Every structure is written in C-alpha cells, then in structure tokens.
Curated annotation (Swiss-Prot), chains A, B:
Location relative to the cell: Cell inner membrane
Name this protein carries in UniProt: ATP-dependent lipid A-core flippase
Ranges for domain ABC transporter: 331-563
SUPFAM superfamilies named in the record: ABC transporter transmembrane region, P-loop containing nucleoside triphosphate hydrolases
Organism encoding this protein: Escherichia coli (strain K12)
Gene responsible for this protein: msbA
Enzymatic class: translocase
Chain segments annotated as transmembrane: 52-72, 129-151, 156-175, 242-262, 264-284
C-alpha cells in the first residue's frame, strides 16, 4: 500500500530528507554525549586535569543545543511532510467523494465520512511518520552505539553482537504473545460491552415489566466478567516489559561476568567501562522500538489502504454526450425500470408518464412508496437501469450529468444550505456570470426579504455555518431565490412543509406560479391548493401508475382525497 | 478535585497500599541499581582487583528481579483497585440509571451514555491510577536519588537542590505556554473540521448546481488552513521538550563547572562523579512527570464529574403509597394536562376520558399529535403535570410505581427484546413464579409456538442478540404471551405495524379478543378491523378529545373514517 502512497509523498521529499538527516544527527548527539564520559573520568578524575574538564561543560551544551535544534528540525520538517502527505490526500479524498454517487452516502457509509477524512486521514501521517521518526532515529542510535563499542571495547562489543540479537528476538516473541492474548480478549470486552447497550436501549420495557432487579443482577454479572478479563488483560500487558527488562539485565550481567572471566578483560579503564555500561542501558529503548516499528507502520498503512478503498470506488457515471443550454421542450418518462441499490424490491415498474411543456404534473401526496424516489431519476441521483427518460424529447443518457443537473432545480424543506455569502449562494458557480444586479431583484420577487432585510447584511452576509439559520420554510424560499436565476426547465418542489406560515406559503405559491409561467414543473402535492392548481396529475402509487388525469378526474376518482 | 469519591475506594485500599509499597520498592531498585556503579568503579575496575566485582552481576539480577516483580505487583494490585473502583462505579451508575426517569432517555443523552458508562468510567481509574503510579513511583525516585546524592556527594548535591526547583518552575512555565497555545486554537481546528462536514452532508445541492469546482476551491483553502494550524500545533508541542532538555543540560553543565574547582575536587572518586552524573540524568524523567501529575489527576477526576452529575440526577418519582394487587376496575382520566419535557407547546390539555371495565377503547392516529403520548401517562413514563388518572377509582400518585407498571403492559411493534432464555424472557422477573407449565400453555394459545418450534431448542432456547432474531410480529406475540401469564388488568397496544403478515393477523386478532375477554384494553387503532371491532371509540388529537362515540358516530362524523 506504501507503494501506492509513494507518488503522493514523492514531490514532498525535501522536508523528508532534511528529516532523515536531522534525525541521524539526533542519533549522533546521544551516542557522542556518552563518549565524553571517557574523557571525563579517564582524563578528568584519572589524570587530574582542569584543562580537559573546563571545556566539558561547554561541549555538553553544544551537543545539547545541537540536540534541541535537530529535534525541532526533525519534528517540523517531518511534520511538513506530514502536512503535505495528509493534506494532499485529504484533498484527493474530498474531490473524489463529491463525485461519487449519492447512493454511497445512502448507508454504504453514513456517519464515518468525517472520520474517513479527519481521523483515518491523520493515522496515515501520525503513525506512518512515527515509523520514519523511529526507523531512522532509533535505527541510527543502534549504529552509533555499536560504532562506539567497536571504537572503545571490541572485547565486549563482540559479546553484545552475540547477545543483543537474541534479546531482540526475545522481545519480539514475548511482545507477540502479549499481543495475541490482548487482541484475543478485545472481541471479548467488545461483546460484553454491547450487552449494556442492549439493556440501556430498552429502558421502556425494563420499567414496564415487573422489576429491574433481574436486570441489575445480569449487569452485575457482566460487569464482574468485564473486570475479571480486564485485569487479565492488564496482567498480560504489564508483565511483558518486566520480562524484557529482566532478559536485558541478563545481558548486562553476562557482560559484567565476561568483564572478568579472562585476564584480558579488567585491563579496561574506568572511563571505557562506564561508557560501555551507559551505552548498554541506552541500547535497550532503540532495540525495543525497532522491533515495535512494524506495528505502527502496518497500522498506518492498513488505514491508508482503507482510505484507498474509499478513493478507488467507481465515480458517478459520466458518459453523457450532449451539452444542454436549455431543455426548451418537456420531460417524458418511458418504461423506466428502477430499483434501489442494495435492495431487491423494484422501486418503480414500467412508467410512461408525460409531463407537458409550460405546465405542471403534480403527484399523489401520500403514495406510501415511490413518491420521492421518482424525483431522483430526473436529477440522476440514482441512474436508471433500463428504460429511458426524454429530456426535451431527447434521452437522458445522452446528456452530461453536469449539463443535465444544470437544468434541474430541486426545492425542499430538507435543502442543505451553502455557507458562503448570499450573493455567492444565490449564484453558486455562477457568481462571475450572474451579478448582484440580478440578486437584488431576485430577493425582491422572492418574498424572502422579511429575513434577508432583517438580517441587516443580507445583500452580502455569510448564510451558513449556522450563521443566520433561516428556518426550513425560509430555506425553501431562498431555494426559490436560487432557482430565480431562471430558465430551469424542471422545478421539483417536494412541498413537504405541511405548515401554512403567515404569507410564506402564499409567497411560495406565487413564486411557483412565476416559475410556471415560462418553465415546466413536477411537484409532489400534499397541500390541497397545489392539487387544485395542478394541470395534469399523474398519480402514481406502489411503483405503478394507478390513475392519470387532471383535478376533475382526481375528484371523480378520489382514492385518498381528504380535507 | 475537592474531597471526592473516597468511599468508593475506601474498602478497596488493601490492594492500594500494596501498590504504594511495591512502587516505593520500585523507586528503591532504580536508585540502588545505580549506587552499585561506585563499587564497580572503585572496588572493581579501580583499586581492588576482583572478588567484590564478581558479586556485582549477582546483585544486578537480584535487584532486577525485584524490579520486575515490584512492577508486576504494582501494575496488578493497582489494577485490582481499578477493578473495584471501576466495577463499583459502573454498578452504581447502572443501578441509578434505570430507576432514573425515561425523560433522560428523551435525548438528554443520545449515544454518549455508553461513553459515560464504559469509557468515561474507564478513564477515572485509568488516569487517576496513572496519576498515582507517577506521584508515588516517580515521586519516590526523586527522594531515592536525592538520598543517594546526599550520601555520596554532599558538595554538589546542594547545588543540584538549588537548581532542581528552578528547572521545575521552568518546566511548569514552558508547559503552561504550550497548554495555552495548543488548546487556544483547538477550537479553530474544530471549526475547520466541521466546514468539511457541513458541505459533505449536503451532497445534494452541491451536485445539482454544478458547484463541484467552487466546492473544491473552497475546500482547498480550509485544508490549507488545517495544515497551517496543525504545523503550529506540532511546533508548539515539540518545542517544549528541546527547551526542557536544554535547560536540564544547563544544570548538567553548571554542576560540571562546579566540579572543576579545587574545593570539591579530590573528594569525589571516579565512581562518585559517575554515579552523581548518571543520577542527574535519571532525575530528568521523574521531575518532568511529577509536574504532569495535576495534568492527569485533573484531566481525570474532572471527567469523573460527568459520572457524578449522572449519579446526582433526580430519581424517578416513586412517591406512590398504595400497592395494587388486581386492577379489574375501569379507569378514568380526569382533567389531565401534560407537556412533553423541554417544550412550551402543551402536548395535552384537559381531557376527561373513560376506559371501561372489560372493554376496549380505540384511537386513530390522523394528526399524529398525542396518539402515543396518552399511552405514556398510563404507565407514567412521563408524570402528569396536573389532573388525575383515577385508575380503578384511585389516582396514580397514590399508586406505587412498580405496582402501577405491573398492572399495565405495553405491546407495540417497537418492543425491545432482551438477551435471555425464551422461558425466562416470557417470565421476565417472574421465572420463579411462572413455571414452564405456564409458559408452554400460554405460548400454545398465544399462537407463537410454531416460531418457537422453528428454531433449535424451543422452550429453553435463547432469545439473545443476533441469535434467533424473531420478527416484529413474532416478538409482538411474545409480548401477548407475557401479558397472558401476567394477566395485566390494564392493556395498551399501539399497532404501529402496517403490513398484516400471513399467519399473524388472525393470530393477533384472536389473541386480542382473548385480551378483552376479562381485561381492559386501550388500543391505538390503525387497522380498520380493530376500528370496527372497537367498542367505545374516543378520537383524540391536538391535546383534547376531538370526537366521541363508537364507529356509528364516527360514520356520522367521518373525517378519515372511510380510509
Ligand atoms: C536539575 C534537574 C535535572 C538535573 C540534570 C538533568 C539532566 C538532563 C540533561 C539531559 C537531558 C535529556 C538528555 C537525556 O535524557 O538523554 C536521553 C537519551 C540518552 C542519551 C544520554 C544523554 C545525556 C548523557 C550524559 C553524558 C554525560 C557526560 C533522551 C531522553 O530523555 O529520552 C527519554 C527516554 N530515556 C532515554 O532515552 C535514556 C534513559 C536510559 C538511557 C541511559 C543513558 C546513559 C546515560 C549515562 C549516564 C551519564 C553519566 C554516567 O536514561 C534515563 O532517562 C534513565 C536512566 C539513566 C540512569 C543511568 C543509567 C546507566 C548508569 C551509568 C551506567 C554506567 C525514555 O525512555 C527510557 C525510559 O523507558 C523505560 O521506562 P520503563 O521500562 O517503562 O520503566 C526505561 N526502562 C528500563 O528498564 C531501564 C532499566 O534500568 C535497564 C533495564 C535493561 C538493562 C540492560 C539494557 C540492555 C543491555 C544491553 C541490551 C542487549 C526507563 O529507565 C529507567 O528510568 C530506570 C533507570 O534506568 C534505572 C537506572 C538503571 C541503572 C543502569 C545500570 C546501573 C549501573 C550498571 C551496573 C553498575 C527509561 O526512563 O523515555 C522518556 C520519555 O519520553 C516519552 C514520552 O513521555 O512520551 C516516553 C516514551 O513514551 C511512553 C509513554 O509515555 O507513553 C513511555 C514509556 O514508559 C514507554 O511505555 C513508551 C513505549 O514506547 C510505549 O509503547 O511509551 C516514548 O514514547 C518517548 C519517545 O518515543 C522517545 O523517547 O517519549 C524520554 O524522555 P524525552 O523524550 O526527552 O521526553
């Protein structure tokens, strides 16, 4: 997976290499601080000299200011590659998510989409850089310390080379056994954890049936099991490191025994042995991290693989041919066979529904099925499987999706509002073309200045981020204002307000009449007024046309005509 | 953090003190493993040849065995206190959670409650213990190291004890600047984070207007502002440790310059200076983790304040005094007024309603305004604001709440079955009273035994999560079985299910007719069959009884009676 991530990080190598050289110097400023111990004792408290000891406090600041300056440079210029290999791939994920079919947001992935761009994005540069802060730094501390051992005491360095790899495999095997036991139990605590959710959801039945005592008893039992596995998990966790320390001490003791087993040893000065022993203690942490540097790296790269799954999914079907400036004619349906993806029940049978030019087709307000779904096919939110839809007396498959949707203009109370200025919001992707000269008149005839004027900055104000939070009816009104860039052939109004707010419902009715003077329409009709104002109501229910005819026919065949 | 939580720890202190003595010994096995340097460098490689050095390996395993065993005992017997102050906390929370009214479950908490029962109670004894390991182990390592310095070098130990408070306050102020800078802009990170979320949620209206290009353009700059603030976060985070190391090196250099003078020279051997240099390095970690004690112990108990608020909330109004054995008498609603909690709109104004003895009253959900709310007052899910419900000629406020819920028995499609045996499930809190002789016969004439026989074990099988997974109608039939054994003198049914499943509707209707044989049964009638079989219909919407009389009077005043 790192193979595929490499092109994404490749142009941002300049920060990486500076991180890969400012960390080696961070490994050669911890193995060179220790070397000064040999001058400090052999030449400072052995051969008694002040000249050899007065520059020591100087060089134990220069090395440490180097440690600080290289640590900052590493943590920054590796944060810079962890700011241009997480930001660029965030931008790629967002640019691909916007194009992906809306069916994906229909419970293929519904709430994790933030975590799939924020946290799961961060764990490709907060725990893959942690495998290049450690492979280089702690993997160079080992090399530096071994170079020190060779330069000072080959006699004990050979012994370390014999032993330390054995300590490493010991560390790995005990860590692996602990990890197996830990992740074996993780499913167990998850299973006993969801049990409490199962009780908490049914607070209702728990209250109604005779008592909670039988429920409290079971909760007590599962809590006791929770604890008696949690303590076992901790015992497995906190015993791994003591055994590691003990086996590492076996090396520290075997070297000390080998420091006197022959007469060849014990000829080493105090400085050399103090340096050697200090180095052995400073070899523990890098050995432990170099073995652990396959956990972090593979965690990060598996999370990146899952991000790649999100990124690699099929784009929206972009095979349309004809660019429509205006579908001057009318929309027609023809034998459309559509099913909700992920389901088996067909959503719509063969439909041949005629919507005429310059008029409106209403729909049965409460069909119970296939009411809002039929509005989907004009906007190609979910593409049709078989059967065609005739834009302007021309098939929809022939039309580019952007071109298709430029024509359509949806309105509903559930309309999600953009968050830039009102001037941009009304003319989103059209601000340079449709200037405020149009937007002033649009807000005039929108009947929405009761909140745009009252906002006191309505001509230019941020409309989202919950900045103003116009109510849902006002969202419908400003949706009409959005459509008041006009020339939109199809006008889908969900009309699901169910609330005749004072003059606002009459306002949207008047604006609908204005948008019906020149443009077509296709409305879901719950309100009786629109049903009367409808021109040809092709009522459809249960995936099949049940009745066709204008208001007089619907009065003749009431069906569900009420109130 | 003011005189808090102690009695939940107090009986479980015998495991605590073993953690407070197995950690001091863990402080006295890191400050005593270092002291052995002086024998090694004076009596070992220094003056004396051998025969004392040969003991040093044997005591760098014994001290290390004591290090490992102490660590294991501390990490186990401190988790045992984290397994009798977590388990006790969870049990206290849960036991105070189902007696604590349903009104809390009306989205005062949606799904954070699992946080407050699992994670927010793990993080009381996972970061108060984590701030008691450090304030004892690394609060005794300082004492051990200072004892070592005093015993081995009186001269420069005074210098160190002068600098240490200076290093400590330096650490405190740099950490405070880091805290104030990092957490100042974390809310800015939240702001830029939600900016992607809002525009992702509205996948619609980004694609209908062809605003994908402007969308990516407006996302790119917020991603850039994400990166350019994350860089400042990580630079402020990783600049603290270098400055800390540099100021601590200022100490390591000042002491070394002090070591140069003749006054302290020739009183410190090679071993003495090495041990007081190794100890100086081993004081860095304890000193810098001790100042973070209040950065965990108040990152901790502050979180426990949420649990204490949950546990301090008001209990359910169990002020009833009259215990009811059988409630065969009819029920009265007497000028009852009620509001759904947190809402100014009256959910139910004055109502005077009759539930006759051995008879049924049906409700039709036309407006969907209080159809289900009126059911709740019968079980007193939400208490009555004013007015009375004379149940069997006596008010609910007199009736003890447990008995009150015993008399009633809700049965709706939204019945949350609970994981248990099917027999115990059928006799929830009554498995001792109702034996299998009752269960099998009730299930037989509950018309559910076909489903019980369909899965594996039947009369003793499990009804657990993701197990048998009875359908909606099936679990409704389980609920009628429950009421059948309990013989609930009051019965409530919602019938929110719309589709009448084969081999279920006739069984449901026969069971219902059994349930009005000698029992009162209020019903919410969505089925026309139940409407026609209803005995005394009173139709209630908009908080008051809008229509009266049986289906003949409902034919006189049709409304939606035709449908
Ligand atoms: C006045 C005020 C002050 C006065 C003066 C101040 C002085 C300051 C000046 C310098 C300032 C900074 C410079 C510096 O400090 O140089 C550090 C680098 C070292 C270069 C030296 C630079 C100065 C040299 C001076 C030159 C002088 C001219 C940088 C640093 O600071 O790095 C720090 C780093 N320490 C070191 O590198 C050098 C450590 C060890 C290295 C020693 C260096 C040698 C110095 C020589 C003496 C000098 C004079 C003589 O030196 C120690 O500190 C303690 C030991 C020193 C005592 C002497 C020992 C030898 C004696 C001499 C023998 C001859 C430390 O890791 C080691 C710790 O780990 C184990 O602990 P635990 O196992 O869990 O208990 C050890 N276990 C041990 O068993 C050690 C055992 O004994 C030995 C057992 C094994 C035996 C043999 C080993 C193998 C042998 C051969 C192998 C085959 C502990 O040993 C202890 O304490 C116990 C202590 O050893 C007891 C003493 C034992 C005596 C030894 C022998 C005695 C005599 C021999 C017989 C006679 C030890 O403490 O982590 C810190 C925290 O940072 C964190 C964070 O908080 O997040 C922590 C981590 O994260 C955590 C988390 O918190 O979540 C926490 C962890 O617990 C862990 O769980 C981790 C996991 O990874 C998660 O999976 O997760 C991690 O992440 C980290 C980041 O990744 C990278 O660091 O970040 C880092 O600090 P930070 O990064 O800066 O924030």
């Amino acid at each position: 997976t790192f193979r595929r991530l490499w092109p994404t990080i490749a142009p941002f190598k300049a920060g990486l290499i500076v991180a890969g050289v400012a960390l080696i110097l961070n490994a050669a400023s911890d193995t060179f601080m220790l070397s000064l111990l040999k001058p400090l004792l052999d030449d400072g408290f052995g051969k008694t000299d002040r000249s050899v000891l007065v520059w020591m406090p100087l060089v134990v600041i220069g090395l440490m200011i180097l440690r600080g300056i290289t640590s900052y440079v590493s943590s920054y210029c590796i944060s810079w590659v962890s700011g241009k290999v997480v930001m660029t791939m965030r931008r790629r994920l967002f640019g691909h998510m916007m194009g992906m079919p809306v069916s994906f947001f229909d419970k293929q992935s519904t709430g994790t989409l933030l975590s799939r761009i924020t946290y799961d994005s961060e764990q490709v540069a907060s725990s893959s850089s942690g495998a290049l802060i450690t492979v280089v730094r702690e993997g160079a501390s080992i090399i530096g310390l071994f170079i020190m051992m060779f330069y000072y005491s080959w006699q004990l360095s050979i012994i370390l080379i014999v032993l330390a790899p054995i300590v490493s495999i010991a560390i790995r095997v005990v860590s692996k056994r602990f990890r197996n036991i830990s992740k074996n139990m993780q499913n167990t605590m998850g299973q006993v954890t969801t049990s409490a959710e199962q009780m908490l959801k049914g607070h209702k039945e728990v209250l109604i049936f005779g008592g909670q005592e039988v429920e409290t008893k079971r909760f007590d039992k599962v809590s006791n099991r929770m604890r008696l596995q949690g303590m076992k998990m901790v015992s497995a966790s906190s015993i791994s490191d003591p055994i590691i320390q003990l086996i590492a001490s076996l090396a520290l003791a075997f070297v000390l025994y080998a420091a006197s087993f022959p007469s060849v040893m014990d000829s080493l000065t105090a400085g050399t042995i103090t340096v050697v022993f200090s180095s052995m203690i400073a070899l523990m942490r890098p050995l432990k991290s170099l073995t652990n540097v396959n956990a972090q790296f593979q965690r990060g790269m598996a999370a990146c693989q899952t991000l790649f799954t999100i990124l690699d999914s099929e784009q929206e079907k972009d095979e349309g041919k004809r660019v429509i400036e205006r579908a001057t004619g009318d929309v027609e349906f023809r034998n459309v066979t559509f099913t909700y993806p992920g389901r088996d029940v067909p959503a719509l049978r063969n439909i041949n529904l005629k919507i005429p030019a310059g008029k409106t087709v209403a729909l049965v307000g409460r069909s119970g099925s296939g009411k809002s779904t039929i509005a989907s096919l004009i906007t190609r939110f979910y593409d049709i499987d078989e059967g065609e839809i005739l834009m302007d007396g021309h098939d929809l498959r022939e039309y580019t999706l952007a071109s298709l949707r430029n024509q359509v203009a949806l309105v509903s109370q559930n309309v999600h509002l953009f968050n830039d200025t009102v001037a941009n919001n009304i003319a989103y992707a059209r601000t340079e073309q449709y200037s405020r000269e149009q937007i002033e008149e649009a807000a005039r005839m929108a009947y929405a200045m009761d909140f745009i004027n009252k906002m006191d900055n309505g001509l230019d104000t941020v409309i989202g981020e919950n900045g103003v939070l116009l109510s849902g009816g006002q969202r419908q009104r400003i949706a009409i204002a959005r459509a008041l860039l006009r020339d939109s052939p199809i006008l889908i109004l969900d009309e699901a307000t169910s609330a005749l707010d004072t003059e606002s419902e009459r306002a949207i009715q008047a604006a609908l009449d204005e948008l019906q003077k020149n443009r077509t329409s296709l409305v879901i009709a719950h309100r009786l007024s629109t049903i009367e104002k409808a021109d040809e109501i092709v009522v459809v229910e249960d995936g099949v046309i049940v009745e066709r005819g204008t208001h007089n026919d619907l009065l003749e065949h009431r069906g569900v005509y009420a109130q």
